[PDB]
């Protein structure tokens, strides 16, 4: 299933559009392994033969479309953490203060998060569970204390929270 429009939920009126999408042949990101051993160098490969798209249109009167047309006239950030670090002072880039309806956070591993944002990451040498993509986070118990600076915040508004003493 197509996902981008599963969370955006787009609809198209006339226009004769073009729709092109790319797929992956990197074995690490497409497959999985119990051990997590680099499947790329082990000798695993993938190959496609034919991909076809299935779509479902629906009726809607041109009058309704004209009525509508005349009628209406989350950010992700990853921060480093050197080895054997204990403190981490971060600074959020200044964006629209509005829409700050709470934020989440968890700890991952550099060897597990892929450098999404290219065609192929040569440094991704692991094919196990990618918590950055399937939500299987497990390093949540390694947190001690998180402190916000003195700048005021709306409460559902303390500054420091103790995780474990």
């Amino acid at each position: 299933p197509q996902k981008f429009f599963a969370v955006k939920n787009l609809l198209l009126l006339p226009g004769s559009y073009t729709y092109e999408w790319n797929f992956r042949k990197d074995v690490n990101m497409v497959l999985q392994s119990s051990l997590g051993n680099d499947l790329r160098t082990d000798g695993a490969t993938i190959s496609f033969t034919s991909i076809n798209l299935y779509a479902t249109f629906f009726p809607m009167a041109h009058n309704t479309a004209s009525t509508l047309e005349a009628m209406l006239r989350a950010a992700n950030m990853l921060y480093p953490i050197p080895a054997n670090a204990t403190n981490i002072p971060i600074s959020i880039p200044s964006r629209n203060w509005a829409a700050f309806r709470g934020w989440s956070f968890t700890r991952l591993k550099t060897k597990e998060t892929p450098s999404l944002g290219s065609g192929f990451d040569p440094y991704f040498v692991y094919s196990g569970s990618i918590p950055y993509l399937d939500g299987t986070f497990y390093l949540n118990h390694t947190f001690k204390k998180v402190s916000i600076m003195f700048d005021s915040s709306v409460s559902w508004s303390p500054n420091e929270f103790e995780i474990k003493r």
Binding site: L11, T56, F58
Partner: protein
């Protein structure tokens, strides 16, 4: 850029009337909350006059039913004389009609009117006129100002705003944009982050009723005082001569009315022009934040000789309840308190008719259905996306003039009667389109359930390897 100490000078409000605390003050009446309670169907209280009030019949004493908040207060208090907010017509307006009276008329014209030789009737008529000009004129001006159904609508909506209850709360929740923050003054409509309006939820029981009763009372006082100040600052000494001439021309009729309420009915009409009332009513009632009300409350307290930190103290507690339980002077204050209690119980603050009939999603099916599709909109045909911000603006702007009963407490959805007007959604009007949108949404969801995971099907044949029924 501000370089100044936070406090500022404001001549608008600085006026106080000093008179001795009633023997029948609120704190000295344990069962006061019992009588002050209101039920469905209660009618707006009306002003009273000396005709039906022969004689006033009446410092703090620990009573048997003194509630906690009042119990500690009745004890730690150096109560000698509590000042009251100076609620009065402009000093010049008053000057016009006291200098006209001064006894200038004499007894000859009065005898001509009475057509009788008894001086007792003459003295009674003189007393009636004096009392009318002292208390009943002001009571009539209040009655006309605050009883306008449109004006009462405005007061109800600003109270809704300030206490963040009901439709404003729903709009804030759905909007994802905070709407309570708007604070206004004569329609300027500023915005202040430094304002608290959701702290009243920490109180319940009789602690809440009283506290709110207070907040609303001071808000009404602030409204009237700012209105009077703005009127005073727009006075024309030419209009003063016109008022003098009109009083000279009308005194012959004005000294010839039998009722006292009637006497005051005509004096307000002559002195209070309708055009001026409408101009004042244009945008005068302005959003007030709870913090500003508390600041005003502290002003009243300190200026009146009580430390704000000698534990709890509310100005609304030092005031009588019934008209025949209060000295004539503070009768305006009594009327204000009754009006405040009526509004407080009307607004459900302890929804009124501003929420239940149409603005309530639970009661209004069309509005709920429209809300359900708030975000799943999409139309490109080369935005047209129904954004939260637009729907909330449409919801806020709408208000049905009918079905809003301003004469008594009705609380629709408690009556076993149909609504005055059919319930309709805010932005979407035609129901056919809404049905179509619901249908597409349902098909979307069912498809996502049917193929959300994706399905493995046999390579050689074409059956599903993991079919879900």
């Amino acid at each position: 850029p501000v370089f100044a100490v936070p406090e500022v000078l404001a001549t608008y409000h600085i006026f106080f009337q000093n008179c001795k605390i009633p023997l029948s003050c609120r704190a000295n009446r344990s069962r006061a909350d019992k009588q002050l309670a209101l039920r469905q169907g209660a009618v707006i209280p009306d002003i009273a006059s000396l005709d039906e009030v022969p004689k006033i019949f009446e410092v703090l004493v620990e009573l048997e039913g003194d509630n906690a908040r009042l119990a500690v207060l009745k004890r730690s208090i150096e109560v000698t004389h509590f000042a009251y907010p100076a609620l009065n017509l402009p000093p010049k307006v008053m000057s016009t009609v006291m200098s006209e009276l001064i006894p200038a008329v004499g007894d000859e014209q009065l005898a001509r009117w009475l057509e009788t030789r008894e001086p007792a009737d003459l003295e009674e008529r003189r007393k009636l006129m004096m009392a009318a000009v002292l208390v009943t004129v002001e009571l009539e001006c209040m009655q006309r100002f605050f009883a306008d159904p449109e004006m009462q609508r405005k007061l109800e909506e600003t109270l809704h705003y300030t206490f963040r209850q009901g439709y404003v709360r729903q709009a804030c929740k759905i909007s994802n944009v905070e709407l309570c923050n708007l604070v206004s003054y004569l329609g300027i409509l500023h915005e202040n982050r430094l304002g608290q309006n959701v702290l009243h939820s920490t109180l319940k029981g009789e602690a809440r009723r009283d506290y709110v009763r207070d907040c609303v009372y001071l808000f009404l006082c602030y409204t009237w005082q700012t209105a009077m100040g703005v009127w005073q600052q727009c006075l024309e000494e030419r209009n003063l001569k016109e008022l003098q001439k009109l009083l000279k021309q009308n005194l012959k009729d004005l000294w010839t009315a039998f009722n006292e309420r009637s006497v005051a009915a005509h004096l307000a009409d002559i002195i209070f022009p309708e055009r001026l009332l409408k101009t004042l009513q244009q945008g005068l009632p302005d959003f007030t934040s709870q913090s500003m009300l508390q600041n005003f409350r502290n002003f009243i307290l300190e200026r009146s000789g009580i430390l704000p930190a000698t534990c709890c103290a509310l100005p609304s507690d030092f005031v009588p309840i019934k008209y025949r339980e209060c000295p004539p002077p503070l009768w305006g204050h009594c009327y204000l308190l009754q009006l405040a209690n009526y509004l407080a119980y009307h607004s459900d603050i302890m929804r009124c008719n501003l929420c239940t009939p149409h603005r309530s999603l639970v009661c209004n099916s069309q509005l709920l259905s429209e809300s359900q599709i708030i975000g799943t909109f999409e139309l490109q045909g080369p935005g047209l996306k129904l954004t939260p911000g637009l729907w909330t603006s449409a919801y806020l702007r709408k208000f049905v003039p009918e079905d809003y009963h301003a004469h008594e407490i009705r609380f629709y959805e408690d009556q076993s009667r149909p609504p005055n007007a059919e319930l309709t959604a805010c932005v979407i009007t035609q129901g056919h389109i809404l049905g179509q949108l619901q249908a597409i949404n349902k098909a979307r969801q069912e498809f996502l359930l049917r193929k959300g995971r994706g399905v493995y099907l046999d390579p050689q044949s074409g059956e599903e390897l993991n079919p879900i029924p």
